[PDB]
Design a protein around this ligand. Structure first.
Ligand SMILES: [Zn+2]
Ligand SMILES: [Zn+2]
Ligand SMILES: [Zn+2]
Ligand SMILES: [Zn+2]
Length: 469
């Protein structure tokens, strides 16, 4: 009924936790038929996107499925490295060598060719940074390259273009702290097609001075360059130049179904969008289900960074819902005004946080602020100066005794002991939390859909933009 759903009085009371739990069960079912997870570049994520899209269309929405590039990478087992010629030597995983993250897999046995080495203390090597560092590089060989100056990606792609079958990069050795193994990457953009490993400085030097040497290199990973998706919809009704946007990431980590993280935000937001289908908002409401958040906020950052300036200034507020059903929950509100932790968001954030506070106070419920640690999809909105806020029931942090007496649960335990785990299933969901944070989501969204004036007022106060007539 439009009577109810168009107001902060009607929307929370018609968004029912039992319906949200139904959608959560659907998400867990999606994960159980898709190898146990709903992660980026998996079938579980694709089914999740389809379930959201088809639900949204069934309610009358036009749905935009925004693709963006995504490189799936993970190691499958330890590497191997062996000298076959001049003499047999088996090197030691994570002591003599390690992978470059984002390497391709491979199994290569080849003569080793050092490339433009500049050894010794104080060196400023450019090994493999330029193209004719590979002058007369015999194709098929393993390129032996020293760290220095340019990105590892550039060195390895130069080696591949020069016909290397594999790349070994050893630490620079210009200081004594730069000779061991390190956590290194060839980047998400890397397109050399050949495997890349990292070795200690002393191994690199020994290899560079061994005539005839042949290395047997094995790199056991999966890597696929592919794409994943944001799902976006918005009300047909409402002012398109004063958009209220809400977002919840739809992907899980690889290790589990991600029903609290973040089925909970996704499902509550979907239920709300369905109810809002018949609403009559003053302000347009936009809903986004973000892809690849667990890989580093990739979908939300893509979406924001690719908006036309005219389009970004139509977004008056962004509301983020990421983990709102934690088993040992607290009632956490983004500290948009910096009152608790010193960092406040763009102007209007204070008003959104006070709206959330108001709702909790009127439910007779305790609440407190939580850090803007940039660990969810509001980040790119913050970087663009868009007013934002959101709700959170806690992750790997431990519940204090003060919090236990405000919110129940168990002090000294994690808010979500199944954070990023296989057990983050439908049974990890605390329904009290889910109901109150769903209601709070509904309350603040509806209020903003009727008047943005508590956000506009702080935008104006901070803005300096003086009207002369
Ligand atoms: Zn060079
Ligand atoms: Zn999350
Ligand atoms: Zn997460
Ligand atoms: Zn605050």
């Amino acid at each position: 009924s439009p009577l109810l759903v168009s107001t902060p009085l009607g929307l929370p009371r018609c968004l029912q936790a039992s319906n949200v739990v139904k959608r959560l069960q659907k998400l867990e079912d999606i994960a159980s038929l898709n190898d146990g997870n709903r992660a980026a570049a998996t079938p579980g994520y694709q089914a999740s996107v389809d379930y959201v899209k088809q639900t949204l269309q069934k309610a009358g929405y036009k749905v935009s499925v925004q693709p963006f590039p995504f490189t799936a990478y993970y190691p499958k087992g330890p590497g191997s490295l062996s000298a076959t010629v001049p003499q047999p030597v088996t090197y030691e995983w994570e002591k003599d060598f390690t992978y470059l993250s984002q390497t391709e897999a491979g199994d290569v046995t080849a003569k080793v060719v050092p490339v433009d080495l500049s050894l010794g203390a104080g060196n400023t090597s450019t090994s493999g940074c330029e193209a004719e560092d590979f002058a007369n590089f015999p194709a098929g060989s393993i390129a032996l390259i020293q760290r220095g100056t340019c990105n590892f990606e550039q060195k390895a792609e130069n080696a591949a273009a020069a016909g290397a079958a594999g790349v070994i990069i050893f630490n620079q050795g210009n200081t004594d702290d730069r000779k061991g193994l390190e956590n290194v990457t060839v980047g998400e953009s890397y397109e050399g097609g050949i495997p890349v490993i990292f070795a200690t400085y002393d191994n690199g030097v020994a290899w560079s001075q061994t005539p005839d040497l042949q290395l047997h290199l094995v790199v056991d990973v999966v890597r696929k360059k592919t794409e994943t998706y944001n799902v976006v919809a918005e009300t047909r009704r409402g002012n398109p130049n004063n958009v209220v946007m809400v977002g919840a990431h739809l992907d899980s980590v690889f290790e589990g179904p991600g029903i609290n993280d973040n089925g909970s935000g996704s499902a509550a937001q979907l239920e709300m969008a369905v109810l809002l289908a018949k609403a009559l908002p003053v302000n347009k409401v936009r809903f986004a289900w973000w892809g690849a958040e667990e890989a580093g906020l990739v979908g939300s950052t893509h979406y924001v960074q690719n908006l036309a300036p005219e389009e970004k200034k139509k977004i008056k507020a962004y509301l983020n819902f990421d983990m709102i059903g934690s088993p040992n929950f607290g009632n956490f509100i983004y500290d948009g005004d910096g009152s608790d932790f010193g960092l406040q968001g763009p102007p209007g954030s204070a008003a959104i946080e006070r709206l959330f506070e108001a709702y909790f106070r009127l439910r007779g419920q305790q609440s407190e602020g939580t850090e803007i640690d940039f660990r969810s999809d509001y980040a790119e909105f913050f970087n663009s100066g868009i007013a934002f806020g959101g709700l959170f029931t806690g992750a790997e942090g431990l519940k204090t005794e003060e919090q236990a007496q405000k919110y129940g649960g168990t002090a000294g335990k994690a808010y979500d002991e199944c954070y990023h785990s296989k057990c983050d299933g439908i049974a990890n969901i605390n329904q009290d939390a889910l109901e109150i944070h769903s209601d709070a989501m509904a309350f603040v969204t509806s209020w903003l859909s009727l008047s943005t004036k508590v956000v506009d007022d702080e935008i104006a106060a901070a803005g300096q933009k003086l009207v002369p007539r």
